[PDB]
Structures are given as structure tokens and as C-alpha cells.
Amino acid sequence: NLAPLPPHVPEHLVFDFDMYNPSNLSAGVQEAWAVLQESNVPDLVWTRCNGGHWIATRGQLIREAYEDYRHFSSECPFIPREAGEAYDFIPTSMDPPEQRQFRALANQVVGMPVVDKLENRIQELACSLIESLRPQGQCNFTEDYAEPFPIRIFMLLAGLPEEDIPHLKYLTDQMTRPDGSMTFAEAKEALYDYLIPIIEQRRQKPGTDAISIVANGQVNGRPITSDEAKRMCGLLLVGGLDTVVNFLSFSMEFLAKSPEHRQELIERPERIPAACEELLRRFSLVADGRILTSDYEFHGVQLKKGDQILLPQMLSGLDERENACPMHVDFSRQKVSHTTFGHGSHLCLGQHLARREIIVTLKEWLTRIPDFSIAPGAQIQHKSGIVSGVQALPLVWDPATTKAVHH
Ligand code: HEM
Ligand SMILES: CN1CCC[C@H]1c1cccnc1
């Protein structure tokens, strides 16, 4: 339930929002979070849920905090406190200047140069999976394409066997949307338990895979340690198994419900890149934060050292003060403003990979299965957390309105 209100918190700023189970969940997860942006709600509130923490509700506040790493540290970035304290991935748990040197190494394994070179494999996997579903006239998108498409692409890049997916997928999910069976510390340790032996073997006999590159990597001229490699690989694992996987579902759910918007992409293919950005704004899904390094007055609100503050990446683009008709999806929107990949020194390094996976999915799906919809009488349930997602997305279509395209 609720944590007792801290001495310095003003009662008029209390809004008991629960990030792991928002009250307006059934209306759609983004909609649930948007309640924090209704006219009467202040720019900075305090919730007594999940141990108690502040919550910036507007893009201006969210962008500011992420830029100011001196007052807002990434050292304890998760809600609840025990999870944030136990979180030590690299570079996500570091603040500049220390974290800077580690980004370059991560770029070597997931940056644009590597992505460009994966294009053919990404398109090939997308086409086989899709053509595999096309004649069926149905599927549950989360298990049939959303999880397998991005996860296998990553498992390949990392040199990790596909049979290890169910175990790793379960562990990463306990870190973002815990079902209660595991604490954040335990899931993290089980992940390190999986990676440790592998990093040791990759340093003994290195291959060309992502993990061999990081384990035998160098940061600012010095060699990376075994502990630092483990901390970087864990972050990469969560990225391949719990980011794009959830995003693809929100996107396909929307496309399933808007024969209009998909028709726009079928008729005008060149706007798919632009559509991707708009969908990334409308269906933003990440929400982590920072911890106060000292007593600080921020926009008239007294914050005390150690207070945690959620800065939902998903909220910036949904803010009416950033985009005029927020809940409306407009592919032709002139200034698609958002912070879906973060803001400040920690801007997502996997975004280039993310965009190619989204863009290839939209093009290869619409090209083969242009007509489709939500299964008869099904009500789509969303799930909330550090990374929001979709519980199940069953789709249906008439096979006769599809077409097999050779890749
Ligand atoms: C739709 C997909 C994705 C979204 C929305 C997303 C979002 C984010 C966000 C919000 C951050 C910064 C968090 C913070 O400031 O604390 C971030 C960091 C990061 N992301 Fe992603 N990401 C996505 C996909 C991926 C993928 C696929 C990979 C890699 C396989 C990846 C690798 C990274 C890395 C390395 C960082 C750390 C950067 C740093 O801390 O300096 N991400 N991502
Ligand atoms: C799931 N995480 C929570 C905060 C950042 C996010 C993440 C992890 C790995 C790659 N990109 C984003």
C-alpha cells in the first residue's frame, strides 16, 4: 500500500500514482499515465506508492532533470529503492564524466556501423516469420513475431543459443514488470550467473560476437575488467529482449485498429520512416528516473538529498505543451517531439537498431498482410512498469487478401 508521507512533502502535491499498476490501466497504458497531465495536476507530484517518490509530469521538467546529472544522479535510477540500489548496469548506473568512456565500447557492438551491416539478416528474419503466418489468417503477435523477431536478432549478434531465450526473457521481465516471485536483486544475480562463465570463456577464446567484443574491449585505452564487461552485457541483454519486443505490439495493435493509417503506408511507402517516429512518440514505453545528490529546490518544490524522482520518458511526447493533439496519430506531423529514447548523456545507443527493426517490420508486414484486425470479441490488456507492454495481441485476417512476396 502507501508509505508514510515524508516531513518535507506538501500534502497538496500528493497524487498516489502506481507505476506498476496505474488506476486507469484498462483504457490503455499510455492513457493511464496521461492522467498525470490533466489540467488540475501539478508539474511535480509525490506518490506514496512503491515506497514513495517524486514524479515529473511535463516534458520541460523531464528534459531539464535528465540534463542536470549533478543534481539528478543515475546511480539509483529505478523505483522501488531496493531495485535502484541493486541496479549496476553500465553505463546506465553511472553519471558523467565516468560513464562517457563506456558508451564508445557499446557503440562498437550496437551502433549504426554494426546495424547497417545487419540489414540483410534483419530483413530475412522478418520475411520468414511473416510468410510463416500469412497463410494461417491469425496469430498472437506477442509470441509469434514480437518476441522472436528482435530476440533472435540479438541472440545471434551475442552468440547465445536460442534455446536459452525463455529463461533469459523471464529474468529480464522480473527487472521491468516483476510478477512478485523475484526481487530485483535476485533476477539481476541470476542474469549475472548466466553471463559470468560466458565472459570468462570469451576472454580465453574470443569470437566476433557482441559479448567477445565487450569482454575483450578497451575503454579510453585501458582494458575493460571482467566485472565491467558483465555489467555492460546485462544491459545489452535487456535491450534485445525487452524494448523493441514490447514496442512492436503497441504499434501493430494500433495498425490493426486503424485501416486508415495502414492504408496511408501502403499507398505512400516513403513515409514509413516518418510513421515510425510518430508511433515511437505516441506509444512511448520507458520510465526510469534519478536520485537527488543533494537538497535542491526545483521549480518551487523542495527536494531533499536521497529522494527518488521518476522522469517518465514516455510522458514528454504525450505532453500537450510539446505536441498539439497528443493522443492523435498523425504521420505528417511537422515536429515530432519526444524523449522516447531518453535525453541527456544517456541517450539510447540501440536506437539505430530499434528503428531498423521497426521500419523493416512495418514494410514487410503491410506488404504481405495489408488487411487485418483484432480477433473477434477480444479486449487488449496492457501491462505497466519500468517498460510497458502488451499482455496479448491476437490478430485475424482473410488469407485471400494477403500476398506472398519473394525476398
Ligand atoms: C524501442 C526500443 C528502445 C527504447 C525505447 C530504448 C530506450 C532507452 C532509454 C530511455 C535509455 C536511457 C535510460 C536512462 O536515461 O536512464 C536507453 C539506454 C540505452 N539503450 Fe536503449 N532503448 C531501446 C532499445 C535498445 C536496444 C535494442 C539496445 C541494444 C541492443 C539498447 C541499448 C541501449 C544502451 C547501451 C543504453 C545505455 C546508454 C547509456 O546509459 O549511456 N536500447 N535506451
Ligand atoms: C529497460 N531499461 C530501463 C531503463 C533503460 C531501459 C533500457 C535497457 C537496455 C537498453 N535500452 C533501454
Side-chain angles (χ1 to χ4, degrees):
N1 63 331
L2 314 172
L5 199 69
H8 66 292
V9 183
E11 37 293 317
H12 63 276
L13 296 180
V14 172
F15 188 119
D16 293 330
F17 183 81
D18 181 347
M19 70 173 286
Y20 292 101
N21 190 225
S23 71
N24 191 34
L25 187 41
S26 65
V29 72
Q30 286 75 22
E31 289 77 345
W33 287 71
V35 309
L36 291 167
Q37 299 179 138
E38 290 179 26
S39 70
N40 67 321
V41 195
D43 302 336
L44 229 194
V45 303
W46 172 273
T47 187
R48 292 140 76 208
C49 311
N50 303 117
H53 63 79
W54 293 104
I55 302 183
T57 70
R58 304 293 177 164
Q60 175 193 64
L61 278 285
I62 300 170
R63 294 177 184 257
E64 252 168 84
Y66 275 125
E67 286 174 23
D68 188 3
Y69 57 84
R70 299 174 186 301
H71 287 108
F72 308 101
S73 173
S74 291
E75 219 198 79
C76 177
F78 293 159
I79 299 304
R81 188 174 301 281
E82 56 265 28
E85 284 178 338
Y87 187 72
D88 68 333
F89 285 166
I90 286 168
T92 300
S93 63
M94 299 168 161
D95 299 312
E98 321 95 77
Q99 58 101 215
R100 297 246 182 55
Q101 67 194 138
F102 291 107
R103 284 176 65 91
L105 181 60
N107 252 330
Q108 285 190 59
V109 296
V110 304
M112 180 155 63
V114 171
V115 179
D116 282 343
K117 297 282 79 75
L118 274 180
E119 199 71 26
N120 174 263
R121 297 305 186 220
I122 291 186
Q123 187 153 186
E124 240 207 59
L125 199 257
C127 294
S128 47
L129 268 39
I130 295 177
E131 181 50 35
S132 170
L133 301 177
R134 193 193 57 82
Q136 289 166 23
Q138 59 174 24
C139 74
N140 193 283
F141 193 78
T142 73
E143 83 179 8
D144 296 330
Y145 185 97
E147 298 171 354
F149 176 52
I151 298 173
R152 295 172 182 189
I153 289 311
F154 178 83
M155 291 307 266
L156 168 85
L157 173 63
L160 304 178
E162 299 193 333
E163 59 182 351
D164 285 342
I165 290 173
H167 175 58
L168 294 175
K169 177 57 188 169
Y170 178 82
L171 294 178
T172 61
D173 278 16
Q174 301 315 310
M175 289 187 288
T176 57
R177 288 156 289 144
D179 66 12
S181 85
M182 291 184 97
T183 67
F184 190 102
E186 293 166 352
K188 182 192 76 153
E189 282 294 326
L191 194 61
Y192 286 163
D193 186 54
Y194 174 92
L195 294 170
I196 277 170
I198 296 181
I199 287 166
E200 182 183 321
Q201 68 192 2
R202 254 68 149 163
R203 293 183 141 226
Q204 235 66 71
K205 307 174 200 170
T208 62
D209 56 275
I211 298 179
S212 298
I213 300 296
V214 177
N216 294 99
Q218 299 186 263
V219 276
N220 280 12
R222 47 159 290 240
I224 191 168
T225 64
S226 282
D227 176 72
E228 290 166 336
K230 181 193 61 175
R231 296 160 71 189
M232 189 158 341
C233 289
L235 182 65
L236 294 176
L237 249 177
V238 177
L241 282 54
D242 205 54
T243 64
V244 292
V245 305
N246 301 300
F247 180 79
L248 292 173
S249 283
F250 288 125
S251 291
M252 208 63 77
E253 182 190 341
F254 169 80
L255 248 33
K257 295 176 179 173
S258 219
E260 311 298 288
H261 292 91
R262 88 181 78 120
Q263 209 60 227
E264 177 173 10
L265 298 186
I266 294 170
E267 291 178 4
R268 293 156 288 220
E270 334 72 36
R271 68 217 298 128
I272 295 179
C276 172
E277 207 72 17
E278 177 71 344
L279 288 180
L280 279 164
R281 173 197 74 78
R282 179 57 185 69
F283 308 101
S284 207
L285 63 177
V286 194
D288 76 335
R290 237 110 282 204
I291 191 180
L292 276 292
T293 68
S294 69
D295 282 7
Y296 183 44
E297 192 226 279
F298 192 53
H299 293 241
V301 182
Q302 181 63 244
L303 316 180
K304 275 182 169 55
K305 181 179 178 170
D307 282 359
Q308 299 188 265
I309 182 176
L310 213 216
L311 308 169
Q313 275 84 10
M314 84 143 80
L315 285 192
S316 303
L318 300 178
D319 188 350
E320 61 188 318
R321 286 133 56 150
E322 278 208 19
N323 301 288
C325 277
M327 306 309 275
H328 177 61
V329 178
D330 180 3
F331 295 169
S332 293
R333 199 181 274 283
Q334 321 94 302
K335 217 282 85 70
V336 181
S337 170
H338 68 74
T339 54
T340 297
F341 290 124
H343 191 62
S345 71
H346 293 273
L347 195 60
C348 186
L349 295 172
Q351 63 182 282
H352 309 302
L353 173 60
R355 286 197 184 80
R356 296 317 302 147
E357 284 171 357
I358 296 164
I359 290 170
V360 168
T361 297
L362 299 176
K363 180 193 168 292
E364 306 306 324
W365 184 282
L366 292 174
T367 280
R368 291 173 180 72
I369 315 174
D371 202 338
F372 66 92
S373 60
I374 298 302
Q379 283 153 186
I380 312 302
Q381 184 76 68
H382 286 181
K383 302 284 101 231
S384 187
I386 293 185
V387 178
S388 287
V390 185
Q391 181 192 70
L393 180 57
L395 305 175
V396 300
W397 61 88
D398 182 357
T401 67
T402 71
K403 56 167 161 179
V405 181
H406 200 80
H407 170 76

